Structures are given as C-alpha cells and as structure tokens.
Design a binder for this molecule. Structure first.
Ligand code: SAH
Ligand code: SAH
Ligand code: YRH
Ligand code: YRH
Ligand code: CL
Ligand code: NA
Lengths: 341, 341
C-alpha cells in the first residue's frame, strides 16, 4: 500500500499546487479571516458561483488548508492561516511568488535545463532573473517578502545554534529585506549590523530596519558583491545566495568576501550542505527540488561540503567547520576563514 | 506552528515534484536502471543527457523516494520507482505518462475558468469533448486504456476479498475499460462468466487483454453506447469510475440503461468515490476532491455523496440497497443498486 501511495503522491503534486495557487490568487484566507465563512458570501467576494467555489473549498479542506465545520461553512486551519497577508509569519508572498509564471514556466523545460546546464528563465522572459526583477518593481517587492517568508524558519533558530557574542559588527551580503540580520540584532543588543543589497531590495531592507526599531544599530547600503564587499566587519553572513550562482561566479563572490575578511574577519555561509549520497530529507523544503529550482531560474546549484571547500580553495579560503540547524530548516552554518597559504 | 508550515510547503511545491517524476517517466529511467545498481555515466548515454544534469535529476528522485544512491553516482530503484518499469506486472508507467500529458494537465492551467463556468476546459484547449477527442486519436486512446488499468489495480486486487461474487453466474462491466477489473474477478472465481461493454476503440484493447489472459472461453467483449443500452441477461452489473465522468442528466441516462438490463433479478454495483457531507483529509492513494476537480476540468463530471447518488438512482427507477467499503488506501466504495419498488 505504501510504495504505490508514495508514487501517487509525487504524480498528483502539480494539481494540488493549482488548488493552493487558486486559494492564494483569490485571497480566500483573508476573505475567511478568523471565523466561519459561508460559501455563498465567499462566492460574491471573488465573482465565482457557489457550486464551483464550494468544490475548490472542499478540496482545500481535503488538503488540510480549511475545515468544513457545517455543509458550505469553512474556517482556516493553522496551515490555511499562514496565507493571510496579516499573519505575523505570513507565507502569502512566498505562495504567490513560487506559483507565479516567473518561477513555474521555467520548470516546464526542466529537461532542457538538465541538457544545457543553463537556466530556462532567460529564453521565456528575455533576461537573467535578477535583471528582470530589477526592472519589475511589483515582482521585486514580491521576491523580498517571499525570501522573508522562507527565511523565518532560519531567523527564529540561528541565535540558539550560533554564538554571535565574540563579534562587534556583522555585514549580511545579499541580506534581502534584513529578516535574518534583524532577528540576530534583536537577540544581541550590543551588536551593530549592515545589510548589503541591490538598489531595489535595499529600499525594502531600510523600511524593515525602521519598523524593527533598529535604525540606530543597522546600516542599509546598496552595491554589487561582484565588486568589493565593504571591509572592516568581524562577521560576514551570506544566506541562500551562493546556491543562486554557478561555480565561476561563486569563486568571484567568495574572492570579494576574502578581501573583506582581511586578517580577523570570519565568513558564515548559510545554505544547504548536500550529503555525498542523496536520500529523503526531513526539511520543510526539499534540498534537491531547491537544486533544480536554482538550475532552471539562475543556473545555480546546491553543493556538498567537499564541493564548496573546493570553491573556497580557489578563493584563498577553507571550511573551518559546519554546524547544524534543527532538521526542519534544511540549512547548515558553514564557517569559512582565509587560507594561511 | 512547525507542522502547519511544513504541510503548506509540501502542498505549494507539488508541481515541481511532478515535473521531476514526469522527467523520470518520459526518459524511461526506471527501465534503464532495471533490477540492479546502474552507474550515472551509463544511464547518461541511455537518454542523451550530460552526466552532471542526469545525476542532479537522480539525486532529486532519491530525495523523493523513487530510488537510492548506494555509492556516489550509483542508483537502484525503490519499490516505488519499480512501478514505473514497463515490465512490472503492476506497472503505473502508462498512468504516470497519461496524467503528466498536456491532454490531462493543460485543462488544470485554467482551473479557475472551469470553477466559474462549471464546464470542462479540455474542449477549448483541444477542440472537442474528451471522449470524442480520444475516439479520433488512437495513441492517446491506447495510453488512456493502460492508464485506467494502472489506477484500477488497487480495486482489482481487493474487490474479491471485500465482495461476495459466488451468488452470480454472469458479470457485465459497463465501461469496463481494457477488462482489468473483470479478468481479476474471473481469475479468482472459476465458475463465473464475464462481459466487457465499451466504446469500439477501447473494446479492441479489452479483446487484446482477454486473449492474452487465456479468458476468451468465459469472457466476451461487446461495444456500443451505454446511453442507448447495456447488454441484458446478466446477474451482476459493474460500473466503475464511470458515473463520476458525467453530469447528473447523463448519469440518469446511464442508470436508466442499467435499470432496463437489470429487469427483475439483476443487481448493479456502482464502484466510485462516496464523498462525505463534510470534506476532510482522506488516506486514499488518490485524493477524491482532486478527482472531483479532474472530472470538472476534463469532462464536467463530479464526485458525489451517497444521498446525491441515491436521488439520481430514484430518477432512473433504482434505489441504493447498501454501501460497502474497500481498504482505506483504495478510496472507492461498492454501492449496491437494485430496481425500485
Ligand atoms: N550582484 C548582487 N549584489 C548584491 N546582492 C545581490 C546581487 N545579486 C543578487 N543579490 C541579492 O542576493 C539575494 C539572494 S536571495 C537571499 C536573500 C536573504 N539572504 C534570505 O536568505 O532571505 C537577493 O536578495 C538579491 O537581491
Ligand atoms: N458511451 C459510452 N459507452 C460505453 N462506454 C463508454 C462510453 N463513453 C465512455 N465509455 C468508457 O467508459 C470508461 C470510463 S473510465 C473507467 C474504466 C474502467 N471501468 C476502470 O475503472 O478502469 C472508459 O473506458 C470509456 O471508454
Ligand atoms: C523546494 C524548492 C524551494 C526553493 C526556494 C527558493 O527558490 N529560494 C530561493 C530563491 S527563488 S529566486 C532566488 C532565490 N534564492 C533562494 O534562496
Ligand atoms: C488525483 C485524482 C486523479 C483521478 C484520476 C482520474 O481522473 N481517473 C479517471 C479519468 S481521466 S479521463 C476519464 C477518467 N476516469 C477516471 O476514473
Ligand atoms: Cl543614526
Ligand atoms: Na561591512
């Protein structure tokens, strides 16, 4: 029963996603809100007949997103609640971004990406993903809130699983809207921070730093990590960034980080560390699905320890040590330092 | 908090999981790997992919439980993966290919429009109702026949242990496909005689299966239209995964044909999803609400409650005598239907 059931689960994933994508697109979590909503009331809220919306809501209830309390009356589960825009841990923008054509249409050509080793995004939309997003403000803002949604799991745990006490300054290279650094600064009140981001993402970081009340302890600057990373910090973070890039580009980024570490600086690579032998993984987001997403969108990849250490060696760096996060997060903390010779 | 988030992440990334499985099926990787351990460099030549590209796909497949990486670059199938072999007696290869084909997936890209209109999106995308289309496309017809065999194996294996066929001399399967259900029944009950009633194109697939099974001397194949009639004279009639293909008016017509054929001493066994009044999660290998939405987008059919089916029986001069369960992993029930007083 189990062997067949698992294959049936894998094969019918795309249809499950379309049900979830409809819930997010129709903003049904917000329409339902806290309490019990009548399907006839919800139908008028998003120009659908009652019968059709009832069948979608029955499906969402079967997939664990809603509960049918009485016939035609639905409430959100804890899972459905996370699609509310107003949820403190909202994954709404995460759901919209990963069900948007910009992240899904490149997967229709997964085969061609595997054959070429190059992303399919470019041919579908006319440019590399980051140039496209720099030119599409709505999607760039969606992207920033999506990486926030994903990073909450890591942000909530990183302080318990890494010792930040020895450091006075920390720079987050590709630090997004500052979700990671603000969590770290809130738990370490003597610590000062910098976010280094693209022009477009840095404006999101500025308003997050203000809203977090960290204006006096966290600087926000824009620049290009293919140029020089600003020097003199004791700790540099780089989270969910190296996996966006091929090996030649990762060497250039690590090279820029090496100049910035100088003598005393340490680099903390926050990313999936793939095992040498691939097996099922308890992480909330599958690391091998992450690998193939990075391929189709950006021409990046997830890496083993040995693989990343090889790229470190080309940048004049070495892996000191790899620290785990709780099994559900699926990211590790790779401590990287300059190579004596 | 943790569980609620994890389940939502599982639902959102189903479409990417399905693209990895679709790639495995399309590239015939299950066959290329076979019984043993296969090296990625050998498999790379068997499907015209570079080694790195294929290795990443196989590592994703290992992550999703479809195979195992015993040594770096060396892969074996799991129980789950082995069901995608064409040589497997319980193969779901054709089922996998059918449900990842444009003909079943493109209608899901307009799920919303189907919910709004209550009409299938298939017709707009391909130019005719699904059964018309398949009558005029022999390759998709043959794939469909093999697909339903794959689905029906779970019902076929269990139906004898959960229903007493001993009281009956003759059994007619109304829309019985390639004969998978009735050949399972006849193999377990040596004194039983059977008839498969199907469209002219599918009946050729059924006659092929019946001859290959050595059952020609107690299994006949008859073709026609169950809107016109069902072949009379049989003790037990079966109609499996068929009523859910049609709207209420069409179901009533099918059930009127069955009624005529039942006469006095005939009995009908409707084998289909029985939806509860309140939608909740289900341990079935195939989600019945996703079945509901597949029926909508492909055919404008639907899954139905007991009470709904009972009033459709009433309009045909039939009543539900009782409902019998199958093991929870199957997700279908056996509804006994008899002439009304
Ligand atoms: N050339 C470049 N210079 C600086 N930042 C860049 C860059 N190209 C991409 N980025 C940034 O790299 C980030 C990668 S996504 C990771 C964001 C954040 N660290 C998190 O884990 O949530 C994006 O925020 C993007 O804006
Ligand atoms: N007008 C018609 N007359 C008879 N059979 C029909 C029909 N229209 C469709 N069918 C058949 O009804 C079946 C529905 S699919 C179910 C097939 C089989 N009972 C199984 O469970 O595996 C198809 O095989 C299709 O060919
Ligand atoms: C199961 C797959 C989950 C994938 C999550 C994902 O894609 N993260 C992501 C993206 S999308 S564009 C740039 C980035 N950087 C990232 O870290
Ligand atoms: C996750 C649910 C998928 C259900 C599979 C499905 O729809 N089977 C099916 C089809 S496809 S065309 C005609 C039919 N008749 C059926 O019983
Ligand atoms: Cl200030
Ligand atoms: Na700095």
């Amino acid at each position: 029963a189990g062997a067949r059931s698992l294959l049936m689960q894998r094969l019918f994933g795309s249809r499950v996603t379309e049900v979830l994508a409809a819930m997010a697109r129709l903003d049904l979590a917000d329409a339902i809100g806290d309490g019990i909503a009548d399907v006839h009331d919800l139908a008028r809220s998003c120009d659908l007949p009652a019968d059709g919306l009832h069948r979608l809501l029955r499906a969402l209830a079967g997939l664990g997103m809603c509960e049918e309390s009485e016939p035609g009356k639905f409430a959100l589960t804890a899972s459905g609640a996370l699609l509310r825009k107003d949820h403190p841990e909202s994954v709404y923008d995460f759901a919209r971004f990963h069900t948007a054509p910009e992240t899904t249409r490149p997967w229709t050509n997964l085969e061609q990406a595997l054959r070429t080793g190059r992303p399919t995004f470019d041919e579908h939309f006319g440019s590399p993903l980051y140039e496209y997003m720099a030119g599409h403000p709505e999607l760039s803002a969606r992207f920033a809130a999506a990486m926030r949604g994903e990073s909450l799991a890591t942000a909530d745990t990183i302080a318990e699983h890494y010792d930040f006490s020895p450091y006075r300054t920390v720079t987050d290279v590709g630090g997004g809207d500052g979700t990671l650094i603000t969590a770290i600064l809130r738990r370490h009140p003597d610590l000062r921070g910098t976010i280094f981001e693209t022009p477009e993402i840095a404006e999101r970081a500025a308003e997050r730093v203000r809203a977090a009340g960290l204006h006096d302890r966290c600087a926000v600057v824009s620049g290009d990590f293919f140029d020089l990373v600003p020097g003199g910090a004791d700790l540099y973070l780089v989270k969910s960034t190296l996996h966006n890039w091929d090996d030649e580009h990762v060497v250039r980024i690590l090279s820029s980080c090496r100049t910035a570490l100088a003598d005393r600086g340490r680099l903390l690579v926050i990313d999936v560390v793939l095992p040498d032998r691939a097996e099922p993984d308890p992480a909330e987001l599958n690391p091998y699905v992450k690998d193939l997403q990075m391929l189709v969108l950006l021409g990046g990849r997830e890496r083993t320890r040995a693989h990343l250490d090889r790229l470190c060696a080309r940048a004049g760096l070495v892996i000191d040590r790899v620290l785990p996060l709780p099994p559900h997060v699926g990211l590790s903390l790779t401590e990287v330092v300059p190579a004596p010779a």
